[PDB]
Amino acid sequence: EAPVLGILCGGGPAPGLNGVIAGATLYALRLGWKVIGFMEGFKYLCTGDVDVVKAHTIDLTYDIVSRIHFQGGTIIQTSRANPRKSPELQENVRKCLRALKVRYFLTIGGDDTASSAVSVANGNEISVISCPKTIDNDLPLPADQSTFGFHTARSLGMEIIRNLMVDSKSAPRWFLVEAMGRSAGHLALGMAEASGAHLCLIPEEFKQDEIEFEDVVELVEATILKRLAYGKNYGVCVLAEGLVSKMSKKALYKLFGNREPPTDPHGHILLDDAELARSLSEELLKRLGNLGIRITPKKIGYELRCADPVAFDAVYTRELGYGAIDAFLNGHSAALIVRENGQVKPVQFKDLLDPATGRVRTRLVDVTSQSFKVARVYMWRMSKKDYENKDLVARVAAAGKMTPEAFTEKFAHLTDVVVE
Amino acid sequence: EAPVLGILCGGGPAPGLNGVIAGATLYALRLGWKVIGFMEGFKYLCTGDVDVVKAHTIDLTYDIVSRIHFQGGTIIQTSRANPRKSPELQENVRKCLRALKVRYFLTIGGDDTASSAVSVASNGNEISVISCPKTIDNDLPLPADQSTFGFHTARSLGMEIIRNLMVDSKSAPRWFLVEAMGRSAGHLALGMAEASGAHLCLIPEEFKQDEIEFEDVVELVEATILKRLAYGKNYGVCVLAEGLVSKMSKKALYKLFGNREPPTDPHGHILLDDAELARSLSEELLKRLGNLGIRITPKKIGYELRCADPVAFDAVYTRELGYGAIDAFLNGHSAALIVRENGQVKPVQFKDLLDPATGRVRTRLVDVTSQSFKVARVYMWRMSKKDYENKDLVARVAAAGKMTPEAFTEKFAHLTDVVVE
Ligand SMILES: Nc1ncnc2c1ncn2[C@@H]1O[C@H](COP(=O)(O)O)[C@@H](O)[C@H]1O
Ligand SMILES: Nc1ncnc2c1ncn2[C@@H]1O[C@H](COP(=O)(O)O)[C@@H](O)[C@H]1O
Prior knowledge:
Two copies of one chain form a homodimer.
Chain A: E1 4-9, H1 17-30, E2 34-38, H2 50-55, E3 57-59, H3 62-65, H4 87-99, E4 102-109, H5 111-120, E5 128-132, H6 150-170, E6 174-179, H7 186-195, E7 199-201, H8 213-229, E8 235-240, H9 249-255, H10 276-288, E9 295-300, H11 302-305, H12 311-329, E10 335-340, E11 343-348, E12 353-354, E13 359-360, H13 370-377, H14 384-387, H15 390-399, H16 404-411
Parallel strand pairs in A: 1-2, 1-4, 4-5, 5-10, 6-8, 6-9, 7-8
Antiparallel strand pairs in A: 2-3, 10-11, 12-13
The structure holds adenosine monophosphate (2 copies).
One adenosine monophosphate (AMP) sits between chains B (227, 231, 380-382) and A (29-30, 62).
């Protein structure tokens, strides 16, 4: 019989998922493989019922995939249902795969999607490969080299903020833009720098391993006041949602409205419910609205996951999908498909999943780097040297209707809070 | 006295010129420099008259540059007027640069623009010259894959234009022959074609022989059409690099400009811009294939890409180039080019980028031996070496073109020796 290749998506979508599906499917079909796609990740595979999976499994033919490289989202949907936890759920998945005569199993998704594939992984009977998916640019790819979907997300964010930059200057106002995603500051920083935003704050720039609510308020506050000292009572500040995952007990308590933070049954805090931008706007309007400043929060997140892929991501995901089929052919299994140095190569599971955490390592922003310093130079902010500038402190202090003494007492310490 | 930074653009525009302008201007202003922008490149500096120059130079203030990083084009315009030739013109350009107290001089442009900048350097510690390599074509000798600024914006817009044409050609069955402007290299054409899933792309790099024949290009497109026809599809999109023309033989060019002699500029320099490659191919192919019910339409993609607003990748890129230029002036550099390699912006020295024979910066073509190119080929529709040996397939494609399999092989099988496999 003709070998069967089964494909699914797990976790949250990123632009280009359809590109991976098509890159693997079209090439597979050129070899005479039957391709099937599982709807909603492992959701229905975890049940083990064969006719339930068949009913949520589709034939991925030429016509179905021929033009989805233009399309955001995933045509086979996705789910966060991961069997990684239970030994039984795993057995249920294998039963359906074997019943479907799946010879080649391809998963596209995040950390939990790959752990599911490895737990479910007879290399001659099957072969399993995951394609690491993250919009956040936080794979340990050789620094600079992006993860797929990141270019699409950064570009669309840049366009959204451009409109906000025009609206903020046209009708003076500050926007606090919350960039969804707590893993890393790549998306926040890229949108901000691309767009020329007047400030960006990411968790990586804070020296201390923990962040205080009031230091974030004061960081944005000083920028507003400096801009105001230059006659501009408007701007745009981009905040990475990860700021909240680095906040202290007390800080988190202020963030949730000076109330005990919400809690899941196991004690793990439910950080999704926080509203970092809405909170900072509240506090800032208290301190600053008496100067003629208006402040409005704005979230950017969900509109980015399924935007149509930009051309870089189109080419990227076509090469990733092809590279999956090449790994399958050349006998690989239990490996991850990544592009490093213009080559798509299967990096083995062990050789890329950090066994300490039991998960692929996280690439954060490098704030010691030349790139980060350049971005900082076009932001509006109070540097160390700025604070030691008697004449400058006099104008910004005047801007905020306070003495130069109070200004230094309040803000000068921030040089020790974030890297210079 | 505050130092004077002078800026100008030469050559054709590429998305992100304003990004470089603003990246450098804003940082220079954070240091207290005066910054001026010469309008239309070297056009008004070659004259040497200082009143006329003063008229076509502007003060690059904070408010002029603060938001242009969103904007395509160049706010100080550009020009191909290169003083690289006559030594009189070069003393004139230097009389105004020295008359304006221009301490630092930044040019943004291509080969002729940098060749111009260098020649005027060869001038006392009173001036320091730097050029910023610009090309939409991606043909700078940067480490492989790494792009020149403007390429991403151009490739992306091209993918969007071709997407519309892909929908149109399938909705109302038709073939489009898209001509991607630029004869330097195949990067732009291949990138647009691959991102868009175009059914064929043809670039000069993929042809083995130094020279190309008109009839080989026709037949390459013809085989793809016929193969799609044999799979039920009388429609598609084919992307062509305009650089096919610069590789054509005398006999090929003779057929391209009609069946006449090619036009010549004085001194024999052929006038290749007048060619209409995709229109010519479209003519010939409708002679051969129209009886099969095939419609074929040329479409050029080119000028709409030069001044598109830059995508985020290019906004960041040009911000970093503009910063890196100021940082280089500050460190006492001069006679250098600003490039980004391995994520760092560094001033490569001009002597270490200029090929000897050509005198200009090494040209980086498409690497057709790479995995990248092979991957792009697999999603194209075409007859491979193996396909020509497949008997059942050759019988289907020949029937689609209403010929015997022997007439099909005699006409097309030799194309496996024309382009790399
Ligand atoms: N934090 C900042 N970020 C970007 N530009 C600034 C900043 N502070 C001042 N500028 C600009 O830098 C230039 C120098 O201003 P001054 O400090 O008055 O010499 C002016 O164009 C200011 O608007
Ligand atoms: N040159 C080509 N490029 C891309 N796909 C092709 C090409 N030729 C055939 N196909 C597709 O490959 C699959 C298998 O073709 P076949 O070998 O005829 O079964 C079908 O979906 C065809 O439409």
